[PDB]
A paper describes a structure:
The Thoeris defense system triggers abortive infection (Abi) upon phage detection. Collectively, our biochemical and structural data demonstrate that the nucleotide signaling requirements for ThsASIR2-SLOG and ThsATM-macro effectors are distinct and suggest that ThsATM-macro effectors can trigger Abi via membrane perturbation by a mechanism that involves nucleotide-induced oligomerization of its macro domain.
The Thoeris defense system in [name] CFT073 consists of a TM-macro ThsA effector (EcThsA) and two TIR domain–containing ThsB proteins (EcThsB1 and [name]). We did not detect NADase activity for [name], but its crystal structure revealed a unique active site configuration with a tyrosine residue within hydrogen bonding distance to the catalytic glutamate residue. Furthermore, AlphaFold2 modeling reveal that many ThsB proteins (subfamilies 7 to 9) found in Thoeris systems with a ThsATM-macro effector have an active site configuration closely related to the NDT family of enzymes, which catalyze base-exchange reactions between the purine or pyrimidine bases of 2′-deoxyribonucleosides and free pyrimidine or purine bases. Our structural data suggest that [name] may be autoregulated, in this case, by a short C-terminal extension that binds to a surface region shown to be important for TIR domain self-association and active site formation in SARM1 and AbTir. The single ThsB protein of BaThs has a tyrosine containing active site and a predicted structure (UniProt/AlphaFold Database: A0A806QQ11) similar to [name] and ThsB subfamily 9 members, suggesting that this class of ThsB proteins produces histidine adenine dinucleotide as an immune signaling molecule.
Author numbering: -2 to 169
Write the structure that this text describes.
Amino acid sequence: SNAMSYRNKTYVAFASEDIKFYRLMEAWKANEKIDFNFFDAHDLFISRDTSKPETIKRNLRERMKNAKQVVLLGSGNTKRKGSDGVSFLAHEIDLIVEFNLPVVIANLDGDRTVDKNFIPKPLLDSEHYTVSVSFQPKIIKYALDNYCVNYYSSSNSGSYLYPTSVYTKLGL
Ligand SMILES: [Br-]
Ligand SMILES: [Br-]
Ligand SMILES: [Br-]
């Protein structure tokens, strides 16, 4: 219950408006359409009515210290909330930048390119190396297995995509 699997390395961050897409991701795990585990902090968001903001902030920092990599669900709500300096997602994004974690942006409209209008401004301003992929299980896992593993050794900076051959070879 409080013990965490070593294989559960991936934190998923999203704007509260986009919870439907996260639930879809949770369906994929329960129905084994995905081949990776992940965790999140939506429980802390839910408990905001019974918790003071300073308590939520400390609990969130604590939660994110266990992440090795991030899947960021990308939409216009991601950019707005993630750039506004006050929202729950804005605090997540600040920690994600501070902890220098790799980020896979999964574009919720299926865009297989970089859409900077889905990426929060602090993450763009950090110039950290990121990759943007469609919101599809197999490309997300490919990014976790490749980009995220290579993040620290790479000399690249800023926003990348995966070329069409990667999607083709995955049967997408
Ligand atoms: Br776990
Ligand atoms: Br939010
Ligand atoms: Br496309």
